[PDB]
Design a protein around this ligand. Sequence first.
Ligand SMILES: CCOC(=O)CC[C@H](C[C@@H]1CCNC1=O)NC(=O)[C@@H](CC(=O)[C@@H](NC(=O)c1cc(C)on1)C(C)C)Cc1ccc(F)cc1
Length: 182
Amino acid sequence: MGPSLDFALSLLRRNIRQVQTDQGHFTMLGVRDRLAVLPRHSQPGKTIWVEHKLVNVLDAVELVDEQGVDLELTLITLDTNEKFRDITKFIPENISTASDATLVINTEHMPSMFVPVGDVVQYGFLNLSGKPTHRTMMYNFPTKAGQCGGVVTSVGKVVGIHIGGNGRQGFCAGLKRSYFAS
Ligand SMILES: CCOC(=O)CC[C@H](C[C@@H]1CCNC1=O)NC(=O)[C@@H](CC(=O)[C@@H](NC(=O)c1cc(C)on1)C(C)C)Cc1ccc(F)cc1
């Protein structure tokens, strides 16, 4: 509710970017330095649109956890002029569920949008259009196409990235701090 909403708003300007790839429109969380995270499904190429600018991509590396499981997110590094404000400290050391979370969407079509998704609960194994992953979490909210990459936040942590849904529920890849270690 209110507390996750205001924390979510504090991330928006400095860290939550509108992007476009050949696959469509996505929300992108910038984490530190020139490092950001996107859904694998966005399939970033050699350039990517960020806000109004076509930006060269330094690399895109699929995020695979310490158990060898693809998390369906890719870590992208960018030929941006400025570094992102470092939000490492807001990514929890442990994958975290949360009550009354906020999902932040920021795309050209859904700009600066805060979605009260309610409680985010453990889900675990998830088969997303035939691609299996784990460590996912679920919220009973009817998320939509165009919300992938959306940032799931608690009172003061960034806990997940929206990756899929079935029309009545939504699912995020869980985040923990070690995923972003250099
Ligand atoms: C570029 C445009 O594409 C997009 O908009 C990305 C947006 C949507 C957001 C969905 C869109 C709808 N409700 C939502 O919240 N995401 C996907 O579509 C994903 C597929 C699903 O959500 C599928 N769901 C399940 O499999 C699923 C399983 C359970 C359990 O619940 N849902 C549905 C398409 C059927 C794409 C994907 C494929 C393979 C993966 F490794 C990982 C992801």
